[PDB]
Structures are given as structure tokens and as C-alpha cells.
Design an enzyme around this catalytic site. Structure first.
Site, PDB file in Angstrom:
ATOM      1  N   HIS A  13      -7.637   9.575  -2.476  1.00 25.96           N
ATOM      2  CA  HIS A  13      -7.156   9.526  -1.089  1.00 25.96           C
ATOM      3  C   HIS A  13      -8.167  10.092  -0.091  1.00 25.96           C
ATOM      4  O   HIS A  13      -8.368   9.532   0.983  1.00 25.96           O
ATOM      5  CB  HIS A  13      -5.803  10.256  -0.973  1.00 25.96           C
ATOM      6  CG  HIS A  13      -4.909   9.726   0.114  1.00 25.96           C
ATOM      7  ND1 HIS A  13      -3.545   9.588  -0.045  1.00 25.96           N
ATOM      8  CD2 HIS A  13      -5.187   9.293   1.366  1.00 25.96           C
ATOM      9  CE1 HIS A  13      -3.019   9.104   1.068  1.00 25.96           C
ATOM     10  NE2 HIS A  13      -3.993   8.925   1.942  1.00 25.96           N
ATOM     11  N   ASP A  19       0.820  -1.201   0.000  1.00 23.32           N
ATOM     12  CA  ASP A  19       0.000   0.000   0.000  1.00 23.32           C
ATOM     13  C   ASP A  19       0.862   1.264   0.000  1.00 23.32           C
ATOM     14  O   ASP A  19       1.563   1.552   0.980  1.00 23.32           O
ATOM     15  CB  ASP A  19      -0.917   0.022   1.218  1.00 23.32           C
ATOM     16  CG  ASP A  19      -1.914   1.162   1.167  1.00 23.32           C
ATOM     17  OD1 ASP A  19      -1.713   2.158   1.897  1.00 23.32           O
ATOM     18  OD2 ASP A  19      -2.890   1.062   0.391  1.00 23.32           O
ATOM     19  N   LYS A  57      -2.423   6.054  -4.392  1.00 24.42           N
ATOM     20  CA  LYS A  57      -3.535   6.960  -4.131  1.00 24.42           C
ATOM     21  C   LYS A  57      -3.293   8.339  -4.722  1.00 24.42           C
ATOM     22  O   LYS A  57      -2.161   8.854  -4.706  1.00 24.42           O
ATOM     23  CB  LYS A  57      -3.808   7.086  -2.626  1.00 24.42           C
ATOM     24  CG  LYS A  57      -3.750   5.763  -1.861  1.00 24.42           C
ATOM     25  CD  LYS A  57      -4.171   5.930  -0.415  1.00 24.42           C
ATOM     26  CE  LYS A  57      -3.909   4.646   0.372  1.00 24.42           C
ATOM     27  NZ  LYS A  57      -2.459   4.468   0.711  1.00 24.42           N
ATOM     28  N   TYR A 116       3.061  10.080   0.817  1.00 25.16           N
ATOM     29  CA  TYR A 116       4.011   9.511   1.795  1.00 25.16           C
ATOM     30  C   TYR A 116       5.473   9.891   1.527  1.00 25.16           C
ATOM     31  O   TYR A 116       6.336   9.669   2.379  1.00 25.16           O
ATOM     32  CB  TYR A 116       3.877   7.981   1.916  1.00 25.16           C
ATOM     33  CG  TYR A 116       2.481   7.482   2.238  1.00 25.16           C
ATOM     34  CD1 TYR A 116       1.506   8.333   2.777  1.00 25.16           C
ATOM     35  CD2 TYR A 116       2.138   6.145   2.018  1.00 25.16           C
ATOM     36  CE1 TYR A 116       0.218   7.874   3.050  1.00 25.16           C
ATOM     37  CE2 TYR A 116       0.852   5.670   2.311  1.00 25.16           C
ATOM     38  CZ  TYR A 116      -0.094   6.539   2.827  1.00 25.16           C
ATOM     39  OH  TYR A 116      -1.362   6.079   3.094  1.00 25.16           O
TER      40      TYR A 116
HETATM   41  N1  NAP Z   1      -5.974   5.987   3.123  1.00 23.52           N
HETATM   42  C1  NAP Z   1      -5.583   6.686   4.191  1.00 23.52           C
HETATM   43  O1  NAP Z   1      -6.072   7.970   4.453  1.00 23.52           O
HETATM   44  C2  NAP Z   1      -4.610   6.095   5.171  1.00 23.52           C
HETATM   45  C3  NAP Z   1      -4.493   6.645   6.448  1.00 23.52           C
HETATM   46  C4  NAP Z   1      -3.649   6.046   7.390  1.00 23.52           C
HETATM   47  C5  NAP Z   1      -2.954   4.895   7.018  1.00 23.52           C
HETATM   48  N2  NAP Z   1      -3.069   4.367   5.747  1.00 23.52           N
HETATM   49  C6  NAP Z   1      -2.332   3.155   5.328  1.00 23.52           C
HETATM   50  O2  NAP Z   1      -2.454   2.182   6.349  1.00 23.52           O
HETATM   51  C7  NAP Z   1      -1.162   1.809   6.799  1.00 23.52           C
HETATM   52  C8  NAP Z   1      -1.186   1.334   8.244  1.00 23.52           C
HETATM   53  O3  NAP Z   1      -1.662   2.341   9.099  1.00 23.52           O
HETATM   54  P1  NAP Z   1      -0.611   3.124  10.033  1.00 23.52           P
HETATM   55  O4  NAP Z   1       0.734   3.065   9.427  1.00 23.52           O
HETATM   56  O5  NAP Z   1      -1.235   4.427  10.345  1.00 23.52           O
HETATM   57  O6  NAP Z   1      -0.601   2.325  11.422  1.00 23.52           O
HETATM   58  P2  NAP Z   1      -0.559   0.775  11.883  1.00 23.52           P
HETATM   59  O7  NAP Z   1      -0.180  -0.141  10.796  1.00 23.52           O
HETATM   60  O8  NAP Z   1      -1.828   0.468  12.564  1.00 23.52           O
HETATM   61  O9  NAP Z   1       0.602   0.827  12.992  1.00 23.52           O
HETATM   62  C9  NAP Z   1       1.923   1.138  12.604  1.00 23.52           C
HETATM   63  C10 NAP Z   1       2.770   1.152  13.874  1.00 23.52           C
HETATM   64  O10 NAP Z   1       2.690  -0.103  14.523  1.00 23.52           O
HETATM   65  C11 NAP Z   1       3.962  -0.684  14.693  1.00 23.52           C
HETATM   66  N3  NAP Z   1       3.856  -2.142  14.484  1.00 23.52           N
HETATM   67  C12 NAP Z   1       3.740  -2.807  13.287  1.00 23.52           C
HETATM   68  N4  NAP Z   1       3.653  -4.128  13.539  1.00 23.52           N
HETATM   69  C13 NAP Z   1       3.706  -4.313  14.876  1.00 23.52           C
HETATM   70  C14 NAP Z   1       3.669  -5.449  15.669  1.00 23.52           C
HETATM   71  N5  NAP Z   1       3.545  -6.652  15.111  1.00 23.52           N
HETATM   72  N6  NAP Z   1       3.728  -5.320  17.045  1.00 23.52           N
HETATM   73  C15 NAP Z   1       3.847  -4.074  17.631  1.00 23.52           C
HETATM   74  N7  NAP Z   1       3.906  -2.943  16.841  1.00 23.52           N
HETATM   75  C16 NAP Z   1       3.826  -3.068  15.484  1.00 23.52           C
HETATM   76  C17 NAP Z   1       4.880   0.016  13.704  1.00 23.52           C
HETATM   77  O11 NAP Z   1       6.189   0.147  14.226  1.00 23.52           O
HETATM   78  P3  NAP Z   1       7.499  -0.188  13.349  1.00 23.52           P
HETATM   79  O12 NAP Z   1       7.336   0.252  11.914  1.00 23.52           O
HETATM   80  O13 NAP Z   1       8.692   0.524  13.957  1.00 23.52           O
HETATM   81  O14 NAP Z   1       7.709  -1.678  13.400  1.00 23.52           O
HETATM   82  C18 NAP Z   1       4.242   1.382  13.590  1.00 23.52           C
HETATM   83  O15 NAP Z   1       4.705   2.198  14.645  1.00 23.52           O
HETATM   84  C19 NAP Z   1      -0.314   3.041   6.524  1.00 23.52           C
HETATM   85  O16 NAP Z   1       1.073   2.787   6.573  1.00 23.52           O
HETATM   86  C20 NAP Z   1      -0.844   3.452   5.165  1.00 23.52           C
HETATM   87  O17 NAP Z   1      -0.283   2.631   4.157  1.00 23.52           O
HETATM   88  C21 NAP Z   1      -3.892   4.953   4.820  1.00 23.52           C
HETATM   89  N1  FID Z   2      -4.016  12.798  10.031  1.00 21.92           N
HETATM   90  C1  FID Z   2      -4.602  12.389   8.906  1.00 21.92           C
HETATM   91  O1  FID Z   2      -5.810  12.186   8.862  1.00 21.92           O
HETATM   92  C2  FID Z   2      -3.765  12.159   7.676  1.00 21.92           C
HETATM   93  C3  FID Z   2      -3.366  10.688   7.589  1.00 21.92           C
HETATM   94  C4  FID Z   2      -2.464  10.408   6.380  1.00 21.92           C
HETATM   95  N2  FID Z   2      -1.827   9.104   6.527  1.00 21.92           N
HETATM   96  C5  FID Z   2      -2.200   8.407   5.437  1.00 21.92           C
HETATM   97  O2  FID Z   2      -1.779   7.201   5.260  1.00 21.92           O
HETATM   98  N3  FID Z   2      -3.023   8.994   4.550  1.00 21.92           N
HETATM   99  C6  FID Z   2      -3.212  10.204   5.100  1.00 21.92           C
HETATM  100  O3  FID Z   2      -3.942  11.113   4.568  1.00 21.92           O
HETATM  101  C7  FID Z   2      -1.398  11.463   6.218  1.00 21.92           C
HETATM  102  C8  FID Z   2      -0.292  11.206   5.407  1.00 21.92           C
HETATM  103  C9  FID Z   2       0.705  12.160   5.241  1.00 21.92           C
HETATM  104  F1  FID Z   2       1.762  11.881   4.454  1.00 21.92           F
HETATM  105  C10 FID Z   2       0.603  13.385   5.896  1.00 21.92           C
HETATM  106  C11 FID Z   2      -0.500  13.647   6.710  1.00 21.92           C
HETATM  107  C12 FID Z   2      -1.502  12.689   6.874  1.00 21.92           C
HETATM  108  O4  FID Z   2      -2.579  12.967   7.685  1.00 21.92           O
END
Ligand code: NAP
Ligand code: FID
Length: 320
Positions: free
Chosen positions: A113, A45, A80, A50
Site C-alpha cells: 500500500h 479495488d 493491498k 478501508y
Molecule cells: N493506493 C492508494 O494509496 C489509494 C489512495 C486513494 C484511493 N485509492 C483507490 O482509488 C479509489 C478512487 O479514489 P477516491 O475514492 O479517493 O476518489 P475518486 O474516485 O476520484 O472520487 C470519489 C468521489 O467522487 C464521486 N463520484 C463518483 N463518480 C462520480 C460521477 N460520475 N460524477 C460525480 N461524482 C462522482 C463519489 O461520490 P459517491 O460515492 O457518493 O457517488 C465520491 O465522492 C479509492 O476508492 C481507492 O479504491 C487508493
Molecule cells: N490521506 C492519505 O494519503 C491516505 C489515503 C488512503 N486512501 C486510500 O485509498 N489508501 C490510503 O492510504 C487512506 C485510507 C484510509 F482508510 C485511511 C487513511 C488514508 O489516508
């Protein structure tokens, strides 16, 4: 590969676990991608916003394609379209930049997005001297038809939506010649999204849970708010199954047939995150995790409190 898949309405198989890449920095993300691919990830993803697609692209060029370790056809790549790129004339240039950075010919999935637009230009966060955003009034239905032209050009296989409400999804479907295949939203036991998921199921969209581990990574945490990985019921199940709390959170989702995209740069965590298809929760254990639902959203656009975009008419979260 390591993960089971769900069938999108397009006929594409989408792995139930993918690698999230938000906050995976240049200087570490190439290694994360390579490790994940080697241990059996077949779903990444990405997003232009990013700031890491150029590095991800180097990892993909070295690892994916003819004469490389992974065939292109076995990999699912999502990116996205960013908020400043909603104008129809900007959509193709935006995708083409993403494809060039990622060093790919085409994307498996391209998401809008957010449903609302920012001012056109090369500043991803165009703002006033007060710090408030300069918005643009391009409607998402106009952007959608522009996105559909990308499928006709063979640049993207499937389209989808990120951070859309049920009303906004229904609005897109009223004009869609190419149906969205996926909705990507924040989802985990605290924000179960039960009704939205059921809504997507009725309309043929699969759901991807973002921040499925509660995004403990995020920079604006309310010290007063609970930490999902520290939830007592989750820890209890982790002990019972000899698994990590993260694996419990992920299992809950994939058992519901919700796609999860946990982000990690830690090889041991990348590995454990995809190893969630060898155990099953009982109906009572699922009910226990279902009871945790509390309408607690972690991921909200914020400024200098305070919600930044929450007052916008096309803000997706204001609906129930
Ligand atoms: N469409 C959108 O608006 C949007 C918004 C937010 C996120 N996203 C996507 O969703 C993805 C995931 O969400 P997120 O990155 O916000 O948070 P997340 O995946 O829920 O959590 C990431 C955090 O959890 C830690 N972690 C990962 N695996 C772990 C494990 N097995 N045990 C303990 N900790 C662990 C990571 O640390 P380390 O990396 O140091 O291991 C990192 O600090 C994003 O990277 C992005 O691709 C999309
Ligand atoms: N706080 C939010 O709602 C969003 C989250 C978000 N992360 C993500 O994966 N999609 C998003 O749009 C994001 C990513 C960035 F690179 C910078 C800001 C940012 O803010």
C-alpha cells in the site's frame, strides 16, 4: 463485460475501469459491489485499511463463483498490504485475513500500500501522545521478497506497488524474482504523472490511476484549491460530447491506456463511470487536458496542515 482491458506482463487482462471502495461503508458497499458487477464491472479495488472487506466478501460470495451470476475467473480483485504488516512474518497472515474477509481463495493482484512501514501490531495507525506515528524500519525490499512467497503459495496471481516513486520502483526491480505488474498512484489532469507513467512503461508495469475524479469525497479539502470536476475545460468537453465531467476525466485516462478505479456508491454514477469506451478525444482535445497539469496532489497523509509522513526518509513524494 462493460470495460476494455489492458494486458499485464503476467498474461492477465486487467479491466481499464474498476470500482474503487475507499469510504464505501459497511451498510452500503455490498449494494455497490452487486450493482457494479451486474452492470458489467469485472474489476474491484479493495484494501484491508478501508475497513469494509468483510462486507465486500458477503457480496462476492452471493454473486461470484460456481452456481452464481459471475464466474470467479472473470473477476479481477485487487487488495493491498497495510503499513503495519511489512514485517516478513506478518505478510502471509495479513493476506490470509484479507482472503478470509473477502471469502476468496486467491487475489488477482496484491499491492504494497505504501513503501514505508508502521509499528507492528493490531493498531492500523500506531501513534504517540502527540499524534505522530510510530514507524517501523522494515525495508520494502524485505517486504517484497515476503510478498513473492505468496505467489508461490497460489494465494495471489500478481504483485504490485502503490505510492512508490521511480527510484523506489527501480529499487524493488533490483531484487524482484516476481516482477511487479502494476503501479497504483494518484493520477488525473492536475497530476498527470507523465514521467512516472513513461518510467513504468519502460519497465513493463501498467499504471492504475487512483483518485481519478479528484477524490471530492476527501475529508480535508483546502477551500482554496480547485475542484477537478469543476474545471472549465472539462465542463466544455462534457457539453461538447453530451457526457458528464467525470466521464471526461475517465476517458482521458483510458485513452492514455491508464487503468482507472473511480469510487462511487451511486448506481447512476457507477454506470456512467464504466461507459467511457464509446467516444474518443481528438489530438487537440487531449492536448487541452494535458495542459491542465499542475503538480497538484490531493491525496497526502495528514495530521491535526499538516503532512504526517512527509518527513520520513522513505516517503515517496519527495522525489521530483
Ligand atoms: N493506493 C492508494 O494509496 C489509494 C489512495 C486513494 C484511493 N485509492 C483507490 O482509488 C479509489 C478512487 O479514489 P477516491 O475514492 O479517493 O476518489 P475518486 O474516485 O476520484 O472520487 C470519489 C468521489 O467522487 C464521486 N463520484 C463518483 N463518480 C462520480 C460521477 N460520475 N460524477 C460525480 N461524482 C462522482 C463519489 O461520490 P459517491 O460515492 O457518493 O457517488 C465520491 O465522492 C479509492 O476508492 C481507492 O479504491 C487508493
Ligand atoms: N490521506 C492519505 O494519503 C491516505 C489515503 C488512503 N486512501 C486510500 O485509498 N489508501 C490510503 O492510504 C487512506 C485510507 C484510509 F482508510 C485511511 C487513511 C488514508 O489516508
Amino acid at each position: 463485460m462493460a470495460a476494455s482491458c489492458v494486458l499485464l506482463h503476467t498474461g492477465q487482462k486487467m479491466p481499464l475501469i474498476g470500482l474503487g471502495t475507499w469510504k464505501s461503508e459497511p451498510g452500503q458497499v455490498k449494494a455497490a459491489i452487486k450493482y457494479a458487477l451486474t452492470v458489467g464491472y469485472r474489476h474491484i479495488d479493495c484494501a484491508a485499511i478501508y475497513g469494509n472487506e468483510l462486507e465486500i466478501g458477503e457480496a462476492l460470495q452471493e454473486t461470484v463463483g460456481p452456481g452464481k451470476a459471475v464466474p470467479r475467473e472473470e473477476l479481477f480483485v485487487t487488495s493491498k498490504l497495510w503499513n503495519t504488516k511489512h514485517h516478513p512474518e506478518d505478510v502471509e497472515p495479513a493476506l490470509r485475513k484479507t482472503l478470509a474477509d473477502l471469502q476468496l481463495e486467491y487475489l488477482d493482484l496484491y499491492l504494497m500500500h505504501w513503501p514505508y512501514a508502521f509499528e507492528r501490531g493490531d493498531n492500523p495507525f500506531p501513534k504517540n501522545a502527540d499524534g505522530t506515528i510510530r514507524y517501523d524500519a522494515t525495508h520494502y525490499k524485505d517486504t517484497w521478497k515476503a510478498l513473492e512467497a505468496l505467489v508461490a503459495k497460489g494465494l495471489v496471481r500478481a504483485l504490485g506497488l502503490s505510492n512508490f516513486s521511480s527510484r523506489q520502483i527501480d529499487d524493488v526491480l533490483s531484487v524482484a524474482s516476481v516482477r511487479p505488474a502494476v503501479l497504483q498512484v494518484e493520477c488525473h489532469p492536475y497530476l498527470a504523472q507523465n514521467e512516472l507513467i513513461a518510467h513504468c512503461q519502460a519497465r513493463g508495469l501498467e499504471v492504475t490511476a487512483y483518485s481519478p475524479l479528484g477524490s471530492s469525497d476527501r475529508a480535508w479539502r483546502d477551500p482554496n484549491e480547485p475542484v477537478l470536476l469543476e474545471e472549465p475545460v472539462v465542463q466544455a468537453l462534457a457539453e461538447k460530447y453530451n457526457r458528464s465531467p467525470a466521464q471526461i476525466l475517465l476517458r482521458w485516462q483510458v485513452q492514455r491506456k491508464v487503468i482507472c478505479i473511480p469510487k462511487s456508491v451511486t448506481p447512476s454514477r457507477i454506470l456512467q463511470n464504466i461507459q467511457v469506451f464509446d467516444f474518443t478525444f481528438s489530438p487537440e482535445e487531449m492536448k487541452q487536458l494535458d495542459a491542465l497539469n499542475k503538480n497538484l496532489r490531493f491525496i497526502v497523509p495528514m495530521l491535526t496542515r499538516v503532512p504526517r509522513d512527509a518527513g520520513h526518509p522513505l516517503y515517496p513524494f519527495n522525489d521530483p
